[PDB]
């Protein structure tokens, strides 16, 4: 929130523009969208999932953070000089991770310090903290963290390492179990302030806003759904 | 993107409405649902100002008689009771591309007056300059609308080009009219070699153009 | 009500360099940019800067010769353009948009809404002149007269007449660029014929560049 403790270096080498959209709401590239959303997987097509939920252990390589279906990295400790901007954690409500100090004292020089870290380590609610985070890297590119995904079970070419709620696979991959990040189901992802800088290809989902319980605790927040 | 606007002079009567059109090469309307263009005016002498941004809201200290209107690629600022504090250069500008801005060429508003025939006078140049080696003859033309005129410098009846220039003040704020300066630059001696030094305006408020000269003796 | 504080003029020979300076008071700004304005010419873009991030966007026409920065502390942006050229001499806007990050999410969109005074750069080989002043001697009706203010650098000079008491149909024409370099300017004014002989008429030029001060009287000749 004390913008004094946002990692703000932020680095055009590349001319993409993506500095705008910090500041201005009409400034995100939705440019490419329309096609790379098509690779992403209705989850029609992934196989039936079975048995008991394990936490996967892998981190498959995508680096395609725009489909529901990506399973993340797991959240670590990462120096302010990688991100650009705001970094967003879910819980599921949207919520500001500000720089730090390796023990998470606040420290507030713009991560332009080698000390400044953003420490996004994430164990879920509702003993955790969060589910996962996202933020923008230093010379433009979406990243994120969070889960564990989870083992659904299936067999064959398509299987599903879920990141989400997956109740069509498998009865009990809620988002409470399986969440790792803002998505919140293969149709839903959670409105905060920089969705569209993030997540570009969402731009022509619809704002519902929604009522959601995780451990007792009810999250009160708007998804943005296809 | 590419700011073409029209028309580029915009001469209006007091009162009367005035209209100036901008587009765009490509549509300036955004997801969000705004066209982002802006429109500037720079008045004579100040330096460019805001008046109407993301189409049609109208900036700080702007009155309700300016108004801007269009979408995608067509766009329209409409003034409704011209003024003479209203004079100026008034620009479109896109700003779907920012940090990145394009401006257009201009359009030049303009109070349009009866139509006025210049007063000619003609100036040899002064002894003091004399004695410098140089020679400037000058021609006036005063208080005249609208704003093209020609001039023409005969030297001993002799037509010249490419030594003379001319200024012309920009308008008047209580008559509306154009004064003009022609300068006709020659040296010590040349202006000794001719005689006859004429010049001759050609206006629309003139039946006939009009010559005043003098002989370098008188 | 932000505000922005500009440089002097600057009088620069080819090939040189010149720093623009351009201080935002009294709040904060989303970006500053630098438009300039040739002779006649109309308005162009040339570069700008977010002063948060310190990072500018130039125009393809001044790539490699022209460098934005933006000092945080002094809340200064700074504009510099190297070999510079007659066709540089141009006034030169510094202009914002924005009140700044509200640090927590974009804004909209609001248009460039605050113009500094601008910064005229004057591009030329001349050396300081002073102007020679000639008399306009005219030569019931209506009378012109009026004083030639030639040869003279850089610019501006001020005409005046009667030392101020003179100013209803007076003409100071803008001056022209001559092929020496040198500017030359003429001021006119008409009086009442009946006045010629008997009213003394004196042009006050004054070229501070220079500490020229001449007053020329311009009698009947
Ligand atoms: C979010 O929602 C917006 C709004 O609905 C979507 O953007 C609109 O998309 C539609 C459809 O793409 C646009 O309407 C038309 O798009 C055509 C592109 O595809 C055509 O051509 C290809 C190639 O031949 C065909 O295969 C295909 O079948 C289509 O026939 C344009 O060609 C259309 O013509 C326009 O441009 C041409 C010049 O290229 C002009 O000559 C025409 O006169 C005309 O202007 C037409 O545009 C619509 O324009 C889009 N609107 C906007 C504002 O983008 C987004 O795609 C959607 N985003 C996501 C991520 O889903
Ligand atoms: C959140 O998860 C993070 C992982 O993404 C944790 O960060 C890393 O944790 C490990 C283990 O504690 C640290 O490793 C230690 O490093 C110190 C310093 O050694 C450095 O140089 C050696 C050279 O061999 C190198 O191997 C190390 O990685 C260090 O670079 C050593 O003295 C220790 O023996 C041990 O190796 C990492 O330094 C640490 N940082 C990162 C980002 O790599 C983080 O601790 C977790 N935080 C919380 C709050 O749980
Ligand atoms: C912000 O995020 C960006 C995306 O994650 C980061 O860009 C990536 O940076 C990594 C290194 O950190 C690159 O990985 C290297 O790629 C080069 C090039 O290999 C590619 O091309 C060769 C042929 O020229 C091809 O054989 C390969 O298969 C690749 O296609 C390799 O030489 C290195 O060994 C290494 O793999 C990524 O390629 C690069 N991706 C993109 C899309 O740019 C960026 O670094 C981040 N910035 C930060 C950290 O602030
Ligand atoms: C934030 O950082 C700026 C330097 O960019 C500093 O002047 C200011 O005092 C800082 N504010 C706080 C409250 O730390
Ligand atoms: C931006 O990243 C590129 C990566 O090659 C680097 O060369 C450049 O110096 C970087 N600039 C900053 C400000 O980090
Ligand atoms: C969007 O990104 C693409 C490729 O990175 C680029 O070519 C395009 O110009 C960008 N659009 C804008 C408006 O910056
Ligand atoms: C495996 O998936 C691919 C998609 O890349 C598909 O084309 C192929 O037919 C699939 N194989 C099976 C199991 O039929």
């Known amino acids: ?226 | 993107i590419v700011m073409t606007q029209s028309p580029l002079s915009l001469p209006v009567t007091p009162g009367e409405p005035a209209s100036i059109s901008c587009t765009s090469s490509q549509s300036l309307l955004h997801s969000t649902g705004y066209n982002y263009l802006d429109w500037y005016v720079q008045k004579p002498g100040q330096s460019p100002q805001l008046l109407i941004y993301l189409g049609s809201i109208r900036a700080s200290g702007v009155p309700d008689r300016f108004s801007g209107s269009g979408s995608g690629t067509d766009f329209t600022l409409r003034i409704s009771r011209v003024e003479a504090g209203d004079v100026g250069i008034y620009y479109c500008m896109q700003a779907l591309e920012i940090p990145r801005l394009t401006f257009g060429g201009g359009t030049k508003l303009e109070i349009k007056r009866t139509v006025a025939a210049p007063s000619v006078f003609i100036f040899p140049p002064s002894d003091e300059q004399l004695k410098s080696g140089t020679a400037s003859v000058v021609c006036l033309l005063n208080n005249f609308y609208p704003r093209e005129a020609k001039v023409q410098w005969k030297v001993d009846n002799a037509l010249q080009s490419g030594n003379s220039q001319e200024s012309v003040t920009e308008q008047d704020s209580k008559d509306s009219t154009y004064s003009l300066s022609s300068t006709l630059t020659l040296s010590k001696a040349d202006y000794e070699k001719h005689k006859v030094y004429a010049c001759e305006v050609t206006h629309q408020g003139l039946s006939s153009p009009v010559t005043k000269s003098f002989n370098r003796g008188e | 009500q932000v505000q922005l504080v500009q440089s002097g003029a600057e009088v620069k020979k080819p090939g040189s360099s010149v720093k623009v300076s351009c201080r935002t008071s009294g709040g904060t700004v989303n970006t500053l940019h630098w438009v300039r304005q040739a002779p006649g010419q109309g308005l162009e873009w040339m570069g700008s800067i977010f002063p948060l991030l310190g990072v500018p966007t130039y125009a393809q026409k001044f790539q490699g010769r022209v460098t934005v920065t933006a000092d945080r502390s002094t809340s200064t942006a700074y504009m510099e353009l190297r070999s510079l050229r007659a066709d540089d001499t141009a006034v030169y806007y510094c202009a914002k948009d924005g009140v700044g990050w509200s640090g927590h999410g974009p804004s909209q969109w609001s248009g460039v809404d605050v113009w500094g005074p601008g910064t005229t750069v004057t591009v030329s080989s001349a050396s300081t002149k002073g102007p020679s002043v000639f008399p306009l001697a005219p030569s019931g009706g209506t009378a012109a007269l009026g004083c030639l203010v030639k040869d003279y650098f850089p610019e501006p000079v001020t005409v005046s007449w009667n030392s101020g008491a003179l100013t209803s149909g007076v003409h100071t024409f803008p001056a022209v660029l001559q092929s020496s370099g040198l500017y030359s300017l003429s001021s006119v004014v008409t009086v009442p014929s009946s006045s010629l002989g008997t009213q003394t008429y004196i042009c006050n030029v004054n070229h501070k560049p220079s500490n020229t001060k001449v007053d020329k009287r311009v009698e009947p000749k």
């Not at chain 1, 403790?5 to 490419?32: E, I, Q």
Request: aromatic fraction near 14%.
């Open chain 1, 1 to 226: 929130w004390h913008i004094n403790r946002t990692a703000l270096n932020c680095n055009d080498s590349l001319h993409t523009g993506f500095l705008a959209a910090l500041f201005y709401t009409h400034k995100f590239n939705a440019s490419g969208c329309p096609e790379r959303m098509a690779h992403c997987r209705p989850i029609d097509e992934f196989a039936q999932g079975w048995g008991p939920i394990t936490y996967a252990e892998g981190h498959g390589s995508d680096q395609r953070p725009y489909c529901w279906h990506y399973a993340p990295r797991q959240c670590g400790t990462i120096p302010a000089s990688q991100v650009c901007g705001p970094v967003y954690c879910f819980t599921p409500s949207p919520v500001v991770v500000g720089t730090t100090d390796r023990f998470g004292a606040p420290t507030y020089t713009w991560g332009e310090n080698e000390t400044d870290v953003l420490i996004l380590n994430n164990t879920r609610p509702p003993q955790g903290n969060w589910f996962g985070c996202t933020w923008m890297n230093s010379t433009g590119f979406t990243k994120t963290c969070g889960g564990p995904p989870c083992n659904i079970g299936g067999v064959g070419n398509n299987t599903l390492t879920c990141p989400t709620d997956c109740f069509r696979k498998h009865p009990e991959a809620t988002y409470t179990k399986c969440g790792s990040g803002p998505w919140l189901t293969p149709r839903c992802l959670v409105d905060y302030p920089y969705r569209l800088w993030h997540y570009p290809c969402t731009v022509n989902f619809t704002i519902f806003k929604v009522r959601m319980y995780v451990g007792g605790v009810e999250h009160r927040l708007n998804a943005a759904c296809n």
